[PDB]
Enzyme design. Sequence first.
Site, PDB file in Angstrom:
ATOM      1  N   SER A  87       0.777  -1.224   0.000  1.00  0.00           N
ATOM      2  CA  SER A  87       0.000   0.000   0.000  1.00  0.00           C
ATOM      3  C   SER A  87       0.814   1.283   0.000  1.00  0.00           C
ATOM      4  CB  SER A  87      -0.939   0.001   1.196  1.00  0.00           C
ATOM      5  OG  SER A  87      -1.591   1.250   1.281  1.00  0.00           O
ATOM      6  N   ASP A  98       0.143  -0.245   7.404  1.00  0.00           N
ATOM      7  CA  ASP A  98       1.492  -0.592   7.842  1.00  0.00           C
ATOM      8  C   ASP A  98       2.435  -0.278   6.674  1.00  0.00           C
ATOM      9  OD1 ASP A  98       1.699  -4.148   6.921  1.00  0.00           O
ATOM     10  OD2 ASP A  98       1.033  -2.360   5.841  1.00  0.00           O
ATOM     11  N   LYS A 213     -10.436   0.688  -3.958  1.00  0.00           N
ATOM     12  CA  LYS A 213     -10.161  -0.025  -2.715  1.00  0.00           C
ATOM     13  C   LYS A 213     -11.321   0.149  -1.740  1.00  0.00           C
ATOM     14  CE  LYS A 213      -6.031   0.157  -0.732  1.00  0.00           C
ATOM     15  NZ  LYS A 213      -6.026  -1.327  -0.539  1.00  0.00           N
ATOM     16  N   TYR A 222     -13.414  -7.653  -1.778  1.00  0.00           N
ATOM     17  CA  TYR A 222     -11.987  -7.395  -1.601  1.00  0.00           C
ATOM     18  C   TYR A 222     -11.385  -8.379  -0.593  1.00  0.00           C
ATOM     19  CZ  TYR A 222      -7.653  -4.613  -0.747  1.00  0.00           C
ATOM     20  OH  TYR A 222      -6.359  -4.180  -0.593  1.00  0.00           O
TER      21      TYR A 222
HETATM   22  N1  LIG Z   1      -0.840 -14.756  -0.200  1.00  0.00           N
HETATM   23  C1  LIG Z   1       0.059 -13.870  -0.617  1.00  0.00           C
HETATM   24  N2  LIG Z   1       1.088 -14.272  -1.421  1.00  0.00           N
HETATM   25  C2  LIG Z   1       1.991 -13.371  -1.839  1.00  0.00           C
HETATM   26  N3  LIG Z   1       2.032 -12.044  -1.565  1.00  0.00           N
HETATM   27  C3  LIG Z   1       0.972 -11.656  -0.743  1.00  0.00           C
HETATM   28  C4  LIG Z   1      -0.029 -12.479  -0.243  1.00  0.00           C
HETATM   29  N4  LIG Z   1      -0.930 -11.765   0.545  1.00  0.00           N
HETATM   30  C5  LIG Z   1      -0.451 -10.545   0.494  1.00  0.00           C
HETATM   31  N5  LIG Z   1       0.697 -10.390  -0.262  1.00  0.00           N
HETATM   32  C6  LIG Z   1       1.596  -9.195  -0.381  1.00  0.00           C
HETATM   33  O1  LIG Z   1       1.582  -8.440   0.830  1.00  0.00           O
HETATM   34  C7  LIG Z   1       1.714  -7.051   0.503  1.00  0.00           C
HETATM   35  C8  LIG Z   1       1.274  -6.243   1.691  1.00  0.00           C
HETATM   36  O2  LIG Z   1      -0.122  -6.449   1.978  1.00  0.00           O
HETATM   37  P1  LIG Z   1      -0.830  -5.880   3.252  1.00  0.00           P
HETATM   38  O3  LIG Z   1       0.164  -5.167   4.071  1.00  0.00           O
HETATM   39  O4  LIG Z   1      -1.623  -6.958   3.888  1.00  0.00           O
HETATM   40  O5  LIG Z   1      -1.774  -4.770   2.582  1.00  0.00           O
HETATM   41  P2  LIG Z   1      -1.630  -3.589   1.565  1.00  0.00           P
HETATM   42  O6  LIG Z   1      -2.086  -4.319   0.326  1.00  0.00           O
HETATM   43  O7  LIG Z   1      -0.212  -3.126   1.694  1.00  0.00           O
HETATM   44  O8  LIG Z   1      -2.747  -2.702   2.279  1.00  0.00           O
HETATM   45  P3  LIG Z   1      -2.796  -1.972   3.724  1.00  0.00           P
HETATM   46  O9  LIG Z   1      -1.395  -2.141   4.105  1.00  0.00           O
HETATM   47  O10 LIG Z   1      -3.845  -2.888   4.231  1.00  0.00           O
HETATM   48  O11 LIG Z   1      -3.227  -0.634   3.234  1.00  0.00           O
HETATM   49  C9  LIG Z   1       0.915  -6.859  -0.751  1.00  0.00           C
HETATM   50  C10 LIG Z   1       1.141  -8.175  -1.465  1.00  0.00           C
HETATM   51  O12 LIG Z   1       2.185  -8.097  -2.422  1.00  0.00           O
HETATM   52 MN   LIG Z   2       1.768  -5.799   5.490  1.00  0.00          MN
HETATM   53 MN   LIG Z   3       0.521  -3.155   4.014  1.00  0.00          MN
END
Ligand SMILES: Nc1ncnc2c1ncn2[C@@H]1O[C@H](COP(=O)(O)OP(=O)(O)OP(=O)(O)O)C[C@H]1O
Ligand SMILES: [Mn+2]
Ligand SMILES: [Mn+2]
EC number: 2.7.7.19
Length: 509
Positions: A87, A98, A213, A222
């Site tokens: 994000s 985060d 989003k 989502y």
């Molecule tokens: N199952 C997965 N396999 C591989 N990469 C993943 C998986 N789930 C999430 N990711 C990776 O994690 C990264 C960070 O996601 P996350 O921190 O949960 O949210 P964001 O998409 O950054 O949103 P917020 O941080 O919620 O605003 C985004 C994606 O590249």
């Molecule tokens: Mn994260």
């Molecule tokens: Mn994140």
Amino acid sequence: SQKVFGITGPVSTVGATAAENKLNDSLIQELKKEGSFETEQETANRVQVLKILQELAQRFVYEVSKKKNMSDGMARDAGGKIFTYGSYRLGVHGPGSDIDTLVVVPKHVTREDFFTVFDSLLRERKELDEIAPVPDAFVPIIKIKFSGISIDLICARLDQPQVPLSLTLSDKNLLRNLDEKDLRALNGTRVTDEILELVPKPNVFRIALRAIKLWAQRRAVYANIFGFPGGVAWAMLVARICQLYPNACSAVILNRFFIILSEWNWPQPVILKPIEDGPLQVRVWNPKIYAQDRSHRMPVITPAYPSMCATHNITESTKKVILQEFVRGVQITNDIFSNKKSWANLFEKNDFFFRYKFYLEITAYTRGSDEQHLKWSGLVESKVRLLVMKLEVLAGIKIAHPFTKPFESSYCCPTEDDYEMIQDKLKLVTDENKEEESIKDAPKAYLSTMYIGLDFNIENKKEKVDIHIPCTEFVNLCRSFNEDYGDHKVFNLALRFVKGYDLPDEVFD
Ligand SMILES: Nc1ncnc2c1ncn2[C@@H]1O[C@H](COP(=O)(O)OP(=O)(O)OP(=O)(O)O)C[C@H]1O
Ligand SMILES: [Mn+2]
Ligand SMILES: [Mn+2]
Ligand SMILES: Nc1ncnc2c1ncn2[C@@H]1O[C@H](CO)C[C@H]1O
């Protein structure tokens, strides 16, 4: 450069009319009202934490290099750098988002070094509010809170001797000789890096993504785990449309977005550039070669090599829901341009629990520790998707719509007769009486509940088609996974058919 217009070139190069800019400003206004953005102060606080983390990454590498009898100049030149993804990297993060951070280190710095040295270097700091090192995740990571900000930290080690401050990870060759985990760690940044590079106007792209989003989360579409697009998916999807309209405002984008995506000839995949090839013996998305790829229902392919399908989970049912929400978007945004509807309309919370006449309630129980329930339930959750697939294919089931947010709740369960009882329907734990002596001690019983909206074919049969086999099965598979799960003393899983009329009061809270 030219690739910023996508693989079909633009649809229209026309600029935005003064009226369209008015609607775009009101769109941004609504986003602000929804607190999508953060304050200049909070942004400045993230820049600062990262600055320090970079300082620590270098220190980390330098220290490890020295312990390898390296020159004072070489340990310094070995470098070490910090990269973000997620994000914050795209610039669509929120007040409570985060910061996903990648740490790149030269050949001589190992992952062990990462959890040892780097970790120790983190603890030696005031700003460290907390650290939760989880060395065995699919992607090794160290989760921490710093200066009041959540930071995800994964480590990638390149097969080279130095990692200079100038290093960018676009070169396909940086992946040479890496292992599965390192390779997995680079992919995140490489992908978000390319997205921003294949979009005409990154700013138009950001507002449109914030909207999507918000919208996706409110319309309950989502959540990758339940068969809906995840964050990366939604992002690539917005980018494909930004490509089609180079100089439009974010507002026209959201409209074209809904129209195009609802008329799209699925499963034609959406890609931001021609799928590349390369060294590694790793598979690249190719539906001609691999069966698994020929079955993706709505493919959204990542641009960085090796291309993968970010939407693998989508089923025939969630596919319908997604089209439905797209259609509702064509209708509403068309109204917003006719001055008959507002953006707030578009961002209205879903009405999942008001739309079906029946529901399948799945509840996972746990009479043990917080870590046990998090595990057990986390398993059931992940499998719900399988049931939706078994269910949506039977007799006359028009749809099996999985809601996306389980309902969490635990009780002080002192006796045994109290457990084999709270699962038949005992003091509801609360953020009030959570750390209170009597409560904080009491043994607990946890339960996570999930729903699947059901629509039976209103053809004209004498009766609905029993869904016992699929349900019992789903139960079995969920127990037959570990010996602890197939217990009954600690863990339990139940599925009850429920009429819309009899839904639990908590579901409408
Ligand atoms: N199952 C997965 N396999 C591989 N990469 C993943 C998986 N789930 C999430 N990711 C990776 O994690 C990264 C960070 O996601 P996350 O921190 O949960 O949210 P964001 O998409 O950054 O949103 P917020 O941080 O919620 O605003 C985004 C994606 O590249
Ligand atoms: Mn994260
Ligand atoms: Mn994140
Ligand atoms: N392939 C991957 N690359 C980077 N971070 C990943 C990842 N898989 C999971 N994660 C981490 O897991 C969290 C989201 O599921 C935060 C994110 O950093």
